[PDB]
Scaffold this active site. Structure first.
Site, mmCIF file in Angstrom:
data_model
loop_
_atom_site.group_PDB
_atom_site.id
_atom_site.type_symbol
_atom_site.label_atom_id
_atom_site.label_comp_id
_atom_site.label_asym_id
_atom_site.label_seq_id
_atom_site.Cartn_x
_atom_site.Cartn_y
_atom_site.Cartn_z
ATOM 1 N N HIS A 9 0.830 -1.193 0.000
ATOM 2 C CA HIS A 9 0.000 0.000 0.000
ATOM 3 C C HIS A 9 0.869 1.249 0.000
ATOM 4 O O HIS A 9 2.049 1.214 0.355
ATOM 5 C CB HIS A 9 -0.901 0.025 1.226
ATOM 6 C CG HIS A 9 -0.144 0.152 2.509
ATOM 7 N ND1 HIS A 9 0.243 1.373 3.029
ATOM 8 C CD2 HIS A 9 0.314 -0.788 3.368
ATOM 9 C CE1 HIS A 9 0.888 1.172 4.165
ATOM 10 N NE2 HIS A 9 0.943 -0.128 4.393
ATOM 11 N N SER A 12 -0.369 6.870 3.932
ATOM 12 C CA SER A 12 -1.527 6.986 4.799
ATOM 13 C C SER A 12 -1.676 8.403 5.351
ATOM 14 O O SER A 12 -0.780 9.251 5.256
ATOM 15 C CB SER A 12 -1.463 5.950 5.931
ATOM 16 O OG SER A 12 -0.223 5.968 6.596
ATOM 17 N N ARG A 60 -5.609 0.151 5.366
ATOM 18 C CA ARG A 60 -4.853 0.735 4.255
ATOM 19 C C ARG A 60 -4.404 -0.337 3.272
ATOM 20 O O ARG A 60 -4.305 -0.071 2.075
ATOM 21 C CB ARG A 60 -3.653 1.539 4.751
ATOM 22 C CG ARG A 60 -2.561 0.748 5.493
ATOM 23 C CD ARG A 60 -1.739 1.713 6.365
ATOM 24 N NE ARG A 60 -0.628 1.096 7.076
ATOM 25 C CZ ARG A 60 -0.624 0.809 8.374
ATOM 26 N NH1 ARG A 60 -1.693 1.008 9.134
ATOM 27 N NH2 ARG A 60 0.479 0.301 8.924
ATOM 28 N N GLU A 87 1.509 -4.999 9.132
ATOM 29 C CA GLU A 87 2.753 -4.266 9.311
ATOM 30 C C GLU A 87 3.413 -4.677 10.623
ATOM 31 O O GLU A 87 2.767 -5.192 11.540
ATOM 32 C CB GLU A 87 2.477 -2.761 9.341
ATOM 33 C CG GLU A 87 3.716 -1.863 9.403
ATOM 34 C CD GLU A 87 4.646 -2.141 8.231
ATOM 35 O OE1 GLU A 87 4.502 -1.475 7.178
ATOM 36 O OE2 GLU A 87 5.498 -3.049 8.332
ATOM 37 N N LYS A 98 10.303 11.093 13.297
ATOM 38 C CA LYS A 98 11.721 10.798 13.515
ATOM 39 C C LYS A 98 12.324 11.682 14.604
ATOM 40 O O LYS A 98 13.034 11.193 15.489
ATOM 41 C CB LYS A 98 12.503 10.950 12.212
ATOM 42 C CG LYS A 98 14.017 10.855 12.372
ATOM 43 C CD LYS A 98 14.682 10.522 11.044
ATOM 44 C CE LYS A 98 16.194 10.775 11.084
ATOM 45 N NZ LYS A 98 16.813 10.607 9.737
ATOM 46 N N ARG A 114 17.145 0.795 14.301
ATOM 47 C CA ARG A 114 17.121 0.836 12.840
ATOM 48 C C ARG A 114 17.881 -0.342 12.224
ATOM 49 O O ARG A 114 17.427 -0.938 11.238
ATOM 50 C CB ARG A 114 17.694 2.175 12.353
ATOM 51 C CG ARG A 114 17.711 2.322 10.837
ATOM 52 C CD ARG A 114 18.188 3.707 10.315
ATOM 53 N NE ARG A 114 18.816 4.597 11.292
ATOM 54 C CZ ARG A 114 18.202 5.601 11.917
ATOM 55 N NH1 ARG A 114 16.897 5.814 11.781
ATOM 56 N NH2 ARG A 114 18.913 6.409 12.705
ATOM 57 N N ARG A 115 19.025 -0.713 12.801
ATOM 58 C CA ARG A 115 19.926 -1.648 12.139
ATOM 59 C C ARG A 115 19.900 -3.056 12.722
ATOM 60 O O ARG A 115 20.439 -3.972 12.098
ATOM 61 C CB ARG A 115 21.366 -1.107 12.173
ATOM 62 C CG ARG A 115 21.608 0.021 11.182
ATOM 63 C CD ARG A 115 22.728 0.970 11.622
ATOM 64 N NE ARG A 115 24.037 0.583 11.095
ATOM 65 C CZ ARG A 115 24.966 -0.077 11.778
ATOM 66 N NH1 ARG A 115 24.775 -0.437 13.041
ATOM 67 N NH2 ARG A 115 26.118 -0.381 11.181
ATOM 68 N N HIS A 184 1.980 -5.184 3.635
ATOM 69 C CA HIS A 184 2.792 -4.074 4.131
ATOM 70 C C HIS A 184 4.277 -4.378 3.956
ATOM 71 O O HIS A 184 4.670 -5.524 3.756
ATOM 72 C CB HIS A 184 2.488 -3.788 5.599
ATOM 73 C CG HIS A 184 1.043 -3.526 5.881
ATOM 74 N ND1 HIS A 184 0.119 -4.542 6.064
ATOM 75 C CD2 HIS A 184 0.379 -2.365 6.101
ATOM 76 C CE1 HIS A 184 -1.065 -4.013 6.322
ATOM 77 N NE2 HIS A 184 -0.931 -2.697 6.362
ATOM 78 N N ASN A 186 6.945 -4.711 5.841
ATOM 79 C CA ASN A 186 7.680 -5.681 6.634
ATOM 80 C C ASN A 186 7.094 -7.076 6.585
ATOM 81 O O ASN A 186 7.829 -8.045 6.828
ATOM 82 C CB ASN A 186 7.769 -5.210 8.084
ATOM 83 C CG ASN A 186 8.762 -4.091 8.251
ATOM 84 O OD1 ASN A 186 9.964 -4.316 8.139
ATOM 85 N ND2 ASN A 186 8.274 -2.876 8.493
#
Ligand SMILES: O=C(O)c1cc(-c2ccc(F)c(Cl)c2)cc(NS(=O)(=O)c2ccc(-c3ccccc3)cc2)c1O
Ligand SMILES: O=C(O)c1cc(-c2ccc(F)c(Cl)c2)cc(NS(=O)(=O)c2ccc(-c3ccccc3)cc2)c1O
Ligand SMILES: [Cl-]
Lengths: 233, 237
Positions: A9, A12, A60, A87, A98, A114-115, A184, A186
């Site tokens: 998608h 949003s 969504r 998701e 952020k 994040r990593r 989604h 992920n």
């Protein structure tokens, strides 16, 4: 050669795809809806035919699928919805942009999150403004206490998606049924990982584009026989 | 009561505007039909209705009505089951003809027979019909036995192929406590109302369900209505 199609998608409301929307049931923005239209038109110009559709329980993704099925005059197809394609659950970060994420948790922790492939963010706690909105949503009431996440690492997300692919989607593909998956980033990521046998470092780099069909051709063992193709311009 | 059931009939289609017989032709909602569904959905929203499973036909004017309702009540996540057995009655050879062409070609007496009978089908959709392949070769019916795919249907035919789906697939869900929503068509919903209320042929043929309006049944544990069907909406509607 089995044919499989994924679509992710688009944007949003309230900028939520840049605010860790996660399990919050954000609707599509008007632009995201338009993207879905375009992805649909693309599938129509190419004459694609499906026999069954899989999606998440988040609107969504569902609306993206409705929009596509509308565009290709196939609203009669069977549709299966499952939380296992939702998701990723971003825990306490759900809804933060952020800067607010960095301010509240610090740059060092954010980078690690994040990593990292199996470090979850902090869990979403009862005073989180989305806590009861998500975790007390009727649609998850059949989930066991250990199935309902308060947060998810990417690995958690894939581990709960893969069983539905194995037990629900593979048997359809094997019977020759042309499958369309509208979901989604992920949850699609887990499917692409298991398909192409990618590494953790690799799946965490894959940036699937939004609103364009993603075509796989697979041999009799559900292995890709070429890279993924896009549809449009 | 123990159980609650909600039915909704779709509103005006594009072919209604051309006063053409649709039956199994897959005509979309007119814009006014779409608004009807939005008001129906809004009426369900204002009353706080909640569902657990939805059933619908494989015809887009019902499916879009269901889509519009699920949207209005914020329950787009619900499971949805589509089946040919909830299709509109198949009008056979009359499919695609408008009122004038039907009256001109068959005359008042023969049409009055068709309107007033219960087990008299209209002429079959022959292979040289302009919509024969658009309907009878549409791949959504590929799983149907040659006996199941109608060439035409009396009202009794339509109810006969609708009631198996209600017995086999909807009743178990209801007795399981699932709150059911059926979005379908005038004549397939007629089958269900006939069965629920034990109405006679004469009665069911006289029954015209309102469109785009939520139809509420309060059933006891045997699926017997405990009061007449109710409508959800504002005072006027
Ligand atoms: O005033 C009159 O003289 C009068 C005349 C007719 C009439 C005339 C010529 C014909 F060729 C026919 Cl078929 C009917 C009809 C009505 N009203 S009606 O009976 O309620 C009636 C409405 C509509 C349909 C219909 C609908 C769809 C397809 C086909 C027919 C049939 C019946 C009259 O009051
Ligand atoms: O609801 C019912 O059970 C019902 C069924 C029929 C019927 C059934 C089988 C047939 F083969 C024929 Cl030909 C007619 C007729 C009427 N009344 S009518 O006045 O004759 C009438 C007919 C047809 C249209 C119409 C035609 C095309 C587009 C949109 C509307 C309108 C009005 C009924 O009340
Ligand atoms: Cl659906």
């Amino acid at each position: 050669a089995y044919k499989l199609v994924l679509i992710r998608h688009g944007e949003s409301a309230w900028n939520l795809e840049n605010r860790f929307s996660g399990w919050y049931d954000a609707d599509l923005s008007p632009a995201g809806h338009e993207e879905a239209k375009r992805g649909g038109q693309a599938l129509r110009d190419a004459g694609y035919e499906f026999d069954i559709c899989f999606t998440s329980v988040q609107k969504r993704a569902i609306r993206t699928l409705w929009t596509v099925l509308d565009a290709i005059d196939q609203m009669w197809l069977p549709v299966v919805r499952t939380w296992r394609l939702n998701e990723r659950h971003y825990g306490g970060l759900t809804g933060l942009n952020k800067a607010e994420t960095a301010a509240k948790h610090g740059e060092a922790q954010v980078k690690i999150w994040r990593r990292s492939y199996d470090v979850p963010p902090p869990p979403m706690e009862p005073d989180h403004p989305f806590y009861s909105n998500i975790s007390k949503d009727r649609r998850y009431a059949d989930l066991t206490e250990d199935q309902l996440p308060s947060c998810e690492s990417l690995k958690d997300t894939i581990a709960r998606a893969l069983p539905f692919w194995n037990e629900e989607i593979v048997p359809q593909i094997k019977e020759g049924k042309r499958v369309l998956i509208a979901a989604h980033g992920n949850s699609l990521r887990g499917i692409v990982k298991h398909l192409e046998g990618l590494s953790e470092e690799a799946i965490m780099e894959l940036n699937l584009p939004t609103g364009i069909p993603i075509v796989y051709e697979l041999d009799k063992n559900l292995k890709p026989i070429k890279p993924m193709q896009f549809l449009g311009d």
